[PDB]
Amino acid sequence: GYLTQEEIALLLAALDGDNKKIAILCLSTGARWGEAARLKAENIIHNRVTFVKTTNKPRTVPISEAVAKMIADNKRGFLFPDADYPRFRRTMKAIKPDLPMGQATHALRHSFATHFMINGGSIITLQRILGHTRIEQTMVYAHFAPEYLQDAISLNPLRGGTEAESV
Amino acid sequence: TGYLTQEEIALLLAALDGDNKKIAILCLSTGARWGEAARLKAENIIHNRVTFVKTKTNKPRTVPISEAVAKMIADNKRGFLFPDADYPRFRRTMKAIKPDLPMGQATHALRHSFATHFMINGGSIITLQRILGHTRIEQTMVYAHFAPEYLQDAISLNPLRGGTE
Numbered sequence A: 001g002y003l004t005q006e007e008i009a010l011l012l013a014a015l016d017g018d019n020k021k022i023a024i025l026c027l028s029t030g031a032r033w034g035e036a037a038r039l040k041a042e043n044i045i046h047n048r049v050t051f052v053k054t055t056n057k058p059r060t061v062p063i064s065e066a067v068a069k070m071i072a073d074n075k076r077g078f079l080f081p082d083a084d085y086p087r088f089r090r091t092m093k094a095i096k097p098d099l100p101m102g103q104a105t106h107a108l109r110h111s112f113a114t115h116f117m118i119n120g121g122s123i124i125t126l127q128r129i130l131g132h133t134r135i136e137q138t139m140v141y142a143h144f145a146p147e148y149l150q151d152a153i154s155l156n157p158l159r160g161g162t163e164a165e166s167v
Numbered sequence B: 001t002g003y004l005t006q007e008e009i010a011l012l013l014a015a016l017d018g019d020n021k022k023i024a025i026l027c028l029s030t031g032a033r034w035g036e037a038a039r040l041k042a043e044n045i046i047h048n049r050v051t052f053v054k055t056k057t058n059k060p061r062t063v064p065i066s067e068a069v070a071k072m073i074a075d076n077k078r079g080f081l082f083p084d085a086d087y088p089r090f091r092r093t094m095k096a097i098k099p100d101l102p103m104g105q106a107t108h109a110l111r112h113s114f115a116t117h118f119m120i121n122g123g124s125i126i127t128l129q130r131i132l133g134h135t136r137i138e139q140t141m142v143y144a145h146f147a148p149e150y151l152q153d154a155i156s157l158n159p160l161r162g163g164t165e
Helices: A005-014 A017-029 A033-037 A065-072 A085-095 A107-118 A123-130 A135-144 B006-015 B018-030 B034-038 B067-073 B087-097 B109-120 B125-132 B137-146 B153-157
Strands: A048-051 A059-062 B049-052 B061-064
Touching: A005 A017, A005 A085, A017 A033, A017 A065, A017 A085, A017 A107, A017 B153, A033 A085, A059 A123, A059 B153, A107 A123, A107 A135, A107 B153, A123 A135, A123 B125, A123 B137, A123 B153, A135 B137, B006 B018, B006 B087, B018 B034, B018 B049, B018 B067, B018 B087, B018 B109, B034 B087, B061 B125, B109 B125, B109 B137, B125 B137
Parallel strands: none
Antiparallel strands: A048 A059, B049 B061
């Protein structure tokens, strides 16, 4: 379950305030709703978001200057004091009627991860980004990665030929 | 895991000859283990695609090869592709070239080489798993640390493409 590009457009158009800012951050980083919602300005360092320890290990995810500007400038302490999750959830559910109960906190994370793989991302990198302790956790997104078996030709150490010359 | 560098591959192919050299090229092209490459028959090579059948611990899979590789290995239109393979000589030659090769691993050194260079060259570890016939990605992850490091992929590849849309 994830939001298509069309659904993302509809969602960001129907959200407002800190809710829309949190959505943008989750779609940009794979954050769960909760860890996005409790972000503080001191957790943004040189356009890199730290999700501090909870129960999860700390991890860091880069964001663009544009996103950092939107969510953090001229703000101190908690970035999103006017977060409104039930309102977010109702809007989400209007956009995605087949969303299972309670998964509104993770849909945007699933959207991040799914599009990351569709777009050509590495499952290894996604694991680190999501904070998964095991690759098996991340493999739920693996079927979204295109498999081009002719990579065996172009990427092999002979570049698809029969010859290798020395220095 | 011990793999051959590009230089070592060049030394190896120059030192090998005949069917051994052909098998080495095929392993370097497909990730094949020595054994499954050496027992290939004409029927396993159809229109530039090599089929490696199911074994005790690896999946069946079909791996594409270039016309040039196909032309090199498809002389025999019937029976074994490489009837004059000589694993002991191949193994000796490999060990002289790569003296720190762990015992027993001459059968897999070219597979490790394929896989390692595949990842260095930007290959998807998920496609590699399929090519090698690994049942679990955990087996393929031994090559993961060779993947190129892109510290900003979360920006470039998220559905907003780094924007606020």
